Structures are given as structure tokens and as C-alpha cells.
Design a protein around this ligand. Structure first.
Ligand SMILES: [Zn+2]
Ligand SMILES: [Zn+2]
Ligand SMILES: [Zn+2]
Ligand SMILES: [Zn+2]
Lengths: 329, 327
């Protein structure tokens, strides 16, 4: 009944209002240390993150889960610095996203399990900071390597009780294959969040996953390139569905009886080197509220659409607490 | 005038016997810091490196050029530590190899140039250690991104006088395209070494590059899977040609008049996370001399084949001094 944060162990009740899928910075391993001027400076990136998290805190956020892996250039010392300055708890992730270097892509299930367990049980790098979640990814049918990662992540979660959260291409229904592999491994679905599930309108796909016991990550609510259809890179990243369309899936899953199984987030960030240059000007145009978009815009939207307060609090406070608390079931 | 090393500037004459294409550790960016246990420990990797460099130093080596880039997991603090304990100069590299992550792959020629220039003119990470060479790579026909890396490398070289050195798939004569792209940016061939050129017996290919003024990197002389050909991953890394066969290309380019354009090395390492697990067990059986292989085995072999000591001196001392001097 402790959750590891970048500033150490917290009790479950200190987590409070939680954003389960976010990033301080979306980058690549070693990149922030090797070319900090890409973001202006390391301090400029940190200050920008602190401004954004302080705003999110003022709107009610107390914890974000940063699901940046090794290969997304997770820098836990940055995360501790930003956490302390903004007085927002940050949970760090182990696992791998879909840009693993050779030194990872050539590893066995056993080797990957050791690496994830290291980051949970011992610490990340030389920092003593322990991960509180495992992040994995597919983009369509799993590559052989991605299957090995799913299996290593299941093994790490069985050994530690730490949960797994996933990147999907929701248009390819990637959750069904991820689910199959987790269930062959023996991982309980209540320890798994199928992410980017708000990228699709296929409610049959989502209820069938929630029927099997999975948590459903509706985690990119503000992602929309509506108004910027002529920006190809921005439309490929954000899609042409509205924030309201995404948000209404939250209502839709409540209405199907699965309020218990929803996790809601922004999937935002304060820098993004692992995409096209200047993407942050597009993102900050699209959603100037940043990580404060869920509490400032989506919570009131869901209320005016009929969702009880009590339900929003189970989704933003109780679901995340239940999910993050280390347990096998 | 001055060459940058991981322990600061040295004068040209301090370089001495120089291995122009080596590695302390072949890895991936951030990997040694995130999982040092893959190598046993950071201490165990440093111990083995210090032992191998001291082995090389005893055989006459004074300087190595570690052509590990960002994406090969170059750790210049490790390089500094082993350089100092072994009393061997290490020149560090900028550039990109063929495992760039997205944060590099999506960058323009102009962005890449700024990055390379940072590592040459300011420093690597927060260390103040500056690169003395630019490493680039193709594996066959250049991808669009690798063409951008070659162009950024040429611009960084023209701005600083620092030389460029390449990875090739020699069986696809990559040096030909590399040379065209460099010349299109105005880079002089005398600032370029076309590497892994000993990976095939293709002297038409090598002499024509050398006739255009390129330096030819015969840099994998001890690489051979002969005797362990049934190990598929060893054979794919090391090839099925003997070290003597590779070394005879050195004699061949000398015989053709190109002694002034040859650079010889081992392309060795002491750890290797960017290949299959336990590869070091194979490598240490194939070439236990490590980075001492050139001075202990190749030099005497070439002497016995009639190459003069003065030609061996120009190749191992003079050619690297001229190549590394910023121009
Ligand atoms: Zn994702
Ligand atoms: Zn994300
Ligand atoms: Zn190479
Ligand atoms: Zn090499």
C-alpha cells in the first residue's frame, strides 16, 4: 500500500486526483543530456513543465503518471525537479515504447524482465528512483520484439504488483492481441490499462475489453487537429475527431456499466523531440490548458452531459488509486 | 596544431602510433547508465577496457580514436576514466551511426549540423569534452536520413577542420555514394576516410576512391569467423575471410602507390550491447590481442611480406597525424 514516486513512497490516499497517462517530455534515450538546446535549454524545459503542472495543480490535479520509458528519453532527475517545484506527485515508468535501440531490441524475454525489475525494485539509473508503472506498446500487429516486451512486462508485474499500461493503435484493435498475450502469461486484467482507447469510435471493441476486466485508457481527450486540416504532421498525430467526441466515450462506457474501469488523461507534454520540429507550437495552439484540460474542460463537459459528480470522482481518484496500488489482482 | 581528446587538447606529435577506428564499448544512447549490469557492472567494463588499452600501449599504441557516436552509446566520462588509467589518448567522436532514435531521425541537415558542431566546438553533454572526429554510416544505398547525416557531417567538417570517417557496406561499394554526397557539399576527400574498406576484396573500388584523394579505412583486420562458421551471428558479424587476407589489402594499396591514404585499425571493443548476448565470449576467443592485434600481428606480417618499416611508420603515425589535424 505504497506507490513509488520520483520523490519516494506515498500512501494511496496522497495520490488524490490523478492523470494516469502524461509526459513531461517526449524524447529519446540520452537526447535531453546530449542536446538540451533543442528545447531551448534543460532549465527552460523544466520551467515550462513547472508552469504547466502548477496550473494543473490549481485546477485540482495532485498526481500525474509519466509513462515515458527509457526509449522515450525519460529523465527521472528532471521529473523529481519538476515534481518538487510544482508540488505535484509524479510516478515514473519502466518498460519500452516503440523506439527501442539495438541494445534493447536484441534482448530476450528474460533480459527484458531483469531490466524492468531493476527499474522497479532497485532504481532507475544511479538515482534510487523506482518506477511505479510498466509501459508497453504495439502499433498494429505486435512485432516479435514487442511480444517479448509484453511478456517481460507481465512477468515484472507478477513479481512486483506494479501495473502495466499500453500504447495501442486503437484503429487496429491492438488491445485484443495485447489482452491475449497478457492472459496466456497469467496477468490479471485488473493490472492492465489498454491505452489510447479514445482514438477509436468502436464501442464494441472497448466494452468487450472492459467485459474481460481491463482498464480502458481514454487518455488523449484534447488531441484534435480540427482547424488545422492542412497541417499533415499535426493531423497524423492528433486525428480529426473532436475533443468532445473523445470525451463522450467516457459517458458511453459509464452508461454501459464500466465506470469502474475507466482511466482519463490528456497524454500531454512540455517538449517533444521524437516528432517534427516545432510541434509544441501546434500543440500549445490546440490545447492551451495543457494537462489542466481534463479538470477545467472535460469534468464540466461531462457534468453538463449528465454524469454525476460521484462518478467523476471514482474515475479521477478511486480508479487510479486502485490501479497503482501494488497487487496481483 | 591541436587535437581534442577526452582529457583535453594534445599536440599533433603527442598522438604517436594511432588506431583510427576503435571502440571502448559498442552500445546504445543511455544504455550503460540505465543497465550497467548488462556488462556485469560499469566497474567490470572499465576494468576490462583498462586491461585491453594497457595491452595495446605495451605493444606501442599511444592513441585510439573511439568512433562511437551518440547512438552507439558513447559515454565520454567512461572514455576519460579509461584513457587516464591506461595512459592512452582517446579521441571522441560526434556524428551518427545507423541506430538513430526518432529524436535524431526526424532532424533536418541544418539541425544535425548544429548538433555535430555542439559536440566539436562546445562539448559533449555537460562534460566539456570535445569531439576530434565526425562518424557517419550507410549500410547500402543511403536512406534519406543518412544522406542528411552525410551532408551535416560535411558542413560540420568545413566549419571546423575536423575529419569525417564512415561506416560502409563495402560489398555494395557504399564509399562511391558517400564520396558523391560529400563532394556535392564541397568537402575535400582528404578530410574523409571511407571505413570498413577491408570487408571485401575489391581493389578496383578502393584504388578509384584512393585516386580521388579519399583515405581508405582498413579497420577490421582481426575480424574473422573462420573456425567458427557454424555460429550464424559470429559469421554475419565477422565474415569468412582471414585476417591475413584483410591485411594483404594493406600491402596491395601500398604496392599501388597509396601508402599515404591508408588508415589501419582493429575496430575492436571491450563491451557490445548492440549485438547478440555473449558476443564478447566469441570476440575474445577470435582476437585475444584486442587492440594490440595491429602492432603485434599485422605489422610483423607486413614486414615479412617485404613492406618497409618507414611505410609502416607513415601509415600508423604520419597518416593519422595528418588526418586528425584540423584543416
Ligand atoms: Zn502512446
Ligand atoms: Zn503517451
Ligand atoms: Zn562500423
Ligand atoms: Zn566501429
Amino acid at each position: 500500500d505504497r506507490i513509488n514516486t520520483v520523490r519516494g513512497p506515498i500512501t494511496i490516499s496522497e495520490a488524490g486526483f490523478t492523470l494516469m497517462h502524461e509526459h513531461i517530455c517526449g524524447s529519446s534515450a540520452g537526447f535531453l543530456r546530449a542536446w538540451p538546446e533543442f528545447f531551448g535549454s534543460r532549465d527552460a524545459l523544466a520551467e515550462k513543465a513547472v508552469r504547466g503542472l502548477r496550473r494543473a495543480r490549481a485546477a485540482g490535479v495532485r498526481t500525474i503518471v509519466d509513462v515515458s520509458t527509457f526509449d522515450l528519453g525519460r529523465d527521472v532527475e528532471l521529473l523529481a525537479e519538476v515534481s518538487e517545484a510544482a508540488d505535484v506527485h509524479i510516478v515514473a515508468a519502466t518498460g519500452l515504447w516503440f523506439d527501442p535501440p539495438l541494445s534493447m531490441r536484441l534482448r530476450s524475454v528474460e533480459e527484458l524482465t531483469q531490466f524492468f525489475l531493476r527499474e522497479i525494485q532497485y532504481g532507475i539509473e544511479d538515482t534510487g528512483i523506482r518506477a511505479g508503472i510498466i509501459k508497453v506498446a504495439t502499433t498494429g500487429k505486435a512485432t516479435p520484439f514487442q511480444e517479448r516486451v509484453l511478456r517481460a512486462a507481465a512477468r515484472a508485474s507478477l513479481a512486483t504488483g506494479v501495473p502495466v499500461t499500453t500504447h495501442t493503435d486503437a484503429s487496429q484493435r491492438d488491445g485484443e492481441q495485447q489482452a491475449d498475450i497478457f492472459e496466456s502469461e497469467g496477468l490479471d486484467p485488473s493490472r492492465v490499462c489498454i491505452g489510447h482507447s479514445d482514438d477509436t469510435d468502436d464501442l464494441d471493441y472497448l466494452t468487450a475489453l472492459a467485459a474481460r476486466g481491463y482498464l480502458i485508457g481514454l487518455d488523449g481527450i484534447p488531441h484534435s487537429a480540427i482547424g488545422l486540416e492542412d497541417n499533415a504532421s499535426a493531423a497524423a498525430l492528433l486525428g480529426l475527431r473532436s475533443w468532445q467526441t473523445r470525451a463522450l466515450l467516457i459517458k458511453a462506457l459509464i452508461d454501459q456499466g464500466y465506470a469502474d474501469q475507466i482511466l482519463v488523461s490528456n497524454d500531454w507534454l512540455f517538449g517533444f523531440s521524437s516528432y517534427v520540429t516545432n510541434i509544441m507550437d501546434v500543440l500549445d495552439r490546440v490545447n492551451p490548458d495543457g494537462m489542466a484540460f481534463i479538470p477545467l474542460r472535460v469534468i464540466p463537459f461531462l457534468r453538463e452531459k449528465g454524469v454525476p459528480d460521484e462518478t467523476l470522482e471514482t474515475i479521477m481518484v478511486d480508479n487510479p488509486a486502485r490501479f497503482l496500488s501494488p497487487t496481483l489482482r
